[PDB]
Amino acid sequence: MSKEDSFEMEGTVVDTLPNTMFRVELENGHVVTAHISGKMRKNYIRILTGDKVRVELTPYDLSKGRITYRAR
């Protein structure tokens, strides 16, 4: 019985993709493209590149995930 699904993973944000996206490095062997909600963006200043945050990868495409929690 498998169970590979979505999960959280800490990473860093250092890249500026288009269409409101950024590259999240999981150089611990993984590379990804995440994005931050719009509400927060407009409700707070965008921190410079390299945001240590929590990345969530999905089974429909781990090469893609989202950010949810950031740290300096």
Interatomic CA distance for residues 58 and 37, integer angstroms:
16
Identify which of 27, 23, 19 has the alpha carbon closest to the alpha carbon of residue 50: 23
Interatomic CA distance for residues 61 and 46, integer angstroms:
26
Q: Which tokens in the block code for residue 31?
A: 């590379």
Interatomic CA distance for residues 60 and 65, integer angstroms:
10
The residues spanned by each domain of the chain are: 1-72
Q: CATH assignment of 1-72, given 1.10.3720.10, 1.10.760.10, 2.40.110.10, 2.40.50.140?
A: 2.40.50.140
